[PDB]
Amino acid sequence: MEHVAFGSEDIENTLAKMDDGQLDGLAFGAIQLDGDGNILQYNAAEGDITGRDPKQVIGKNFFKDVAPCTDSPEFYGKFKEGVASGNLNTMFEYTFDYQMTPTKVKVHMKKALSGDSYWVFVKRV
Numbered sequence: 001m002e003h004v005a006f007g008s009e010d011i012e013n014t015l016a017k018m019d020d021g022q023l024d025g026l027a028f029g030a031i032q033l034d035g036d037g038n039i040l041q042y043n044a045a046e047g048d049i050t051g052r053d054p055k056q057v058i059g060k061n062f063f064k065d066v067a068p069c070t071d072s073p074e075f076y077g078k079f080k081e082g083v084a085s086g087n088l089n090t091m092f093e094y095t096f097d098y099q100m101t102p103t104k105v106k107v108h109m110k111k112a113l114s115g116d117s118y119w120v121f122v123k124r125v
């Protein structure tokens with residue numbers, strides 16, 4: 001296991017070192033998005049939570065293609081305000097319910113240290 005706690009204040013520094021293999025060792029779901037919402041990284045714990053195959057969703061658009069239930073002011077609206085502003089750090093509960101059993105999660109969105117990229121972290125509640 002890679003030892004990093006969900007919601008850690010310096011999480012973006014810790015995950016800057018990780019390749020896709022190391023990201024699969026985390027205790028929670030992790031998705032890296034560009035500023036348009038396309039999926040750059042998607043780890044194994046996320047696929048365990050949602051059923052998606054991590055390899056297959058890389059390159060898809062999270063809000064348009066993969067996760068239409070997040071296309072709402074409560075989730076995508078917070079993302080696009082963070083991208084526009086160049087800062088984002090927010091944590092909230094949400095229900096994922098597209099083509100899956102409805103699953104309640106805690107979501108943390110945070111700007112990456114890397115240029116124009118954004119993390120979405122997820123854990124079951």
Ligand SMILES: *C(=O)/C=C/c1ccc(O)cc1
Pocket residue numbers: 031046050052066067068069070095096097098
């Ligand atoms: C609602 O459509 C959510 C879908 C979803 C959330 C997170 C994922 O990793 C995959 C699909």
